[PDB]
Amino acid sequence: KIEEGKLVIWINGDKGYNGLAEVGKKFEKDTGIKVTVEHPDKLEEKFPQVAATGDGPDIIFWAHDRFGGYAQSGLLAEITPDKAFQDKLYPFTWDAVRYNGKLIAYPIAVEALSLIYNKDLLPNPPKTWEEIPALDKELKAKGKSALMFNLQEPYFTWPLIAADGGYAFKYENGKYDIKDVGVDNAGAKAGLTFLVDLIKNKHMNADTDYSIAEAAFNKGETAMTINGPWAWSNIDTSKVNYGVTVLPTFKGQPSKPFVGVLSAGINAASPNKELAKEFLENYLLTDEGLEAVNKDKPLGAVALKSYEEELAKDPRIAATMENAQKGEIMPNIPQMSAFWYAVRTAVINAASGRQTVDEALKDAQTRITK
């Protein structure tokens, strides 16, 4: 029902929680206050429950998309970083941590899709989507295929659909305009159509899913794939000589993948708000703090400029941040749930011929703005 005089922190089991425990130890010796870190199962489902009764951790770490609902219920306190501290992190990350204009969490890390290719089959990866058809016919002459990635889930195909104009919800003046949806505009249709032409002309198969695409790439059958940092581990084992780079352009516009920002929020019920702020701003969000967490489990690309510049020496991390800066911050509003269902159906329908491109998107759009 509080604790007063200490800090309790929650973070998921797949993150560097032992490394975060170490930043906590440094805090205790410099100030005398104890910090304890915990990683309970399905913690993102528990928080809403215990927090509603005035209980739970003082601060919680999770992808920014879930904090929208939390803030809606008044579970998060408004943070007060001054203009100077805000200057230490890339500007676009702050747009992922606000509900109704108010800052409700500190950005930590950044994640997004990238183009991954086989250097042995393709020493020069394509810069454009338009080039792919010809590259495929060319590689087929030796028994290989150009590209294979998950066509079942919209999170994986949106980068292409969004490239020339698509977007979920318009973001402006620090707020999302629930009525300005971009799924049936010219750009979105052009993108979905190029995707459908790939399938019809036999360059891709409508059934291809996550596991099927990963295997083909790790088996050296296909020259490229589209995936996140969570897949690098497996490619390392496959022994394929791969590279991770900027996504191809479409109609000269950059592909726009969704961006997930690991963030730290403060319980509105916490009697330790000043301690939390001091800890997060002056201990965790420093080159020394993120390094400690990273050493445990890689954070990937980070929001802190100074440290990201060091990390950028790894071309894979440099690519992740590049595709992220060119991508679309995932909206944190409730209406976003309607988006997924409407778009998922639209893409599966167009790929199967069950429905045309122009008609699939029209219906999705009508559905979301409903």
Side-chain angles (χ1 to χ4, degrees), residues 4-269 271-370:
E4 260 281 54
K6 71 164 296 181
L7 286 179
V8 45
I9 303 175
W10 279 8
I11 193 170
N12 208 59
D14 64 341
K15 310 300 192 174
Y17 57 85
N18 288 134
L20 181 60
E22 265 172 286
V23 184
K25 280 307 223 161
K26 168 173 171 56
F27 188 76
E28 179 173 356
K29 54 172 61 65
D30 290 327
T31 71
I33 309 288
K34 57 176 174 173
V35 185
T36 89
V37 188
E38 301 167 359
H39 56 101
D41 294 343
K42 312 201 82 307
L43 74 85
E44 75 282 28
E45 300 302 342
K46 284 184 175 66
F47 186 83
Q49 303 192 287
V50 302
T53 65
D55 299 76
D58 292 87
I59 110 83
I60 170 178
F61 281 81
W62 198 273
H64 79 89
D65 44 345
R66 270 287 244 156
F67 288 4
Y70 295 169
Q72 184 166 162
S73 291
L75 304 184
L76 301 179
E78 182 172 6
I79 59 171
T80 59
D82 62 2
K83 190 189 182 62
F85 178 93
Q86 299 183 200
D87 293 336
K88 293 182 179 187
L89 329 192
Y90 297 93
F92 86 107
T93 59
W94 292 112
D95 297 311
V97 287
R98 69 210 314 168
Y99 200 66
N100 289 187
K102 297 174 186 53
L103 294 66
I104 49 69
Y106 291 81
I108 310 298
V110 184
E111 191 170 77
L113 290 169
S114 283
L115 210 231
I116 299 171
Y117 67 93
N118 179 323
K119 303 179 181 188
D120 289 352
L121 295 176
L122 209 63
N124 183 193
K127 302 307 221 302
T128 198
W129 278 93
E130 290 82 349
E131 278 163 88
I132 295 177
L135 183 66
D136 189 56
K137 172 187 170 188
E138 199 188 308
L139 291 168
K140 251 57 182 292
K142 65 187 62 57
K144 304 288 186 173
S145 77
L147 173 67
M148 287 186 83
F149 73 98
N150 187 4
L151 301 185
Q152 300 310 306
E153 286 301 301
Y155 173 88
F156 288 83
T157 49
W158 187 251
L160 195 187
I161 296 169
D164 200 51
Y167 55 88
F169 290 104
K170 181 59 59 184
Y171 184 70
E172 176 152 284
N173 54 277
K175 192 169 187 59
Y176 280 106
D177 181 353
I178 295 177
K179 280 285 86 70
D180 188 352
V181 176
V183 309
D184 74 347
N185 53 38
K189 292 176 181 178
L192 184 48
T193 293
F194 184 90
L195 177 67
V196 176
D197 282 333
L198 282 175
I199 296 178
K200 288 172 166 51
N201 294 148
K202 312 296 186 184
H203 298 133
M204 297 203 119
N205 187 296
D207 299 343
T208 300
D209 59 21
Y210 194 88
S211 38
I212 292 173
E214 171 180 53
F217 183 77
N218 296 178
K219 293 190 296 177
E221 317 186 317
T222 189
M224 309 183 267
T225 195
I226 291 178
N227 224 320
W230 58 77
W232 300 355
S233 181
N234 258 77
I235 310 178
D236 296 344
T237 305
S238 74
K239 296 296 181 178
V240 180
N241 178 30
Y242 76 97
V244 183
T245 198
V246 58
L247 290 164
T249 60
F250 176 55
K251 282 193 179 297
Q253 307 309 310
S255 286
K256 293 162 179 52
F258 282 124
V259 185
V261 183
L262 178 66
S263 307
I266 297 170
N267 200 312
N272 306 299
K273 302 196 180 66
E274 277 289 298
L275 282 178
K277 166 184 167 70
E278 176 72 11
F279 172 87
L280 292 171
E281 280 188 31
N282 307 298
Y283 290 67
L284 177 58
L285 281 174
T286 57
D287 295 329
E288 297 67 41
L290 305 180
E291 174 65 43
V293 181
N294 191 73
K295 283 176 173 178
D296 187 359
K297 305 187 191 172
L299 285 173
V302 297
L304 187 63
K305 287 173 186 172
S306 70
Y307 190 43
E308 172 61 6
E309 292 173 359
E310 297 166 50
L311 294 186
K313 289 180 179 180
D314 182 329
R316 302 173 302 170
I317 294 177
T320 302
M321 179 59 92
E322 184 177 356
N323 283 311
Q325 279 178 45
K326 281 162 181 169
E328 177 181 1
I329 290 295
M330 162 97 66
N332 59 11
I333 65 175
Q335 289 74 40
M336 195 61 190
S337 75
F339 171 88
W340 298 116
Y341 132 67
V343 179
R344 183 171 195 293
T345 299
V347 180
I348 281 166
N349 282 14
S352 298
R354 187 285 187 62
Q355 184 171 53
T356 73
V357 168
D358 257 69
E359 213 53 51
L361 292 170
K362 174 181 178 182
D363 291 356
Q365 171 76 38
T366 295
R367 270 187 166 60
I368 307 163
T369 59
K370 179 170 63 182

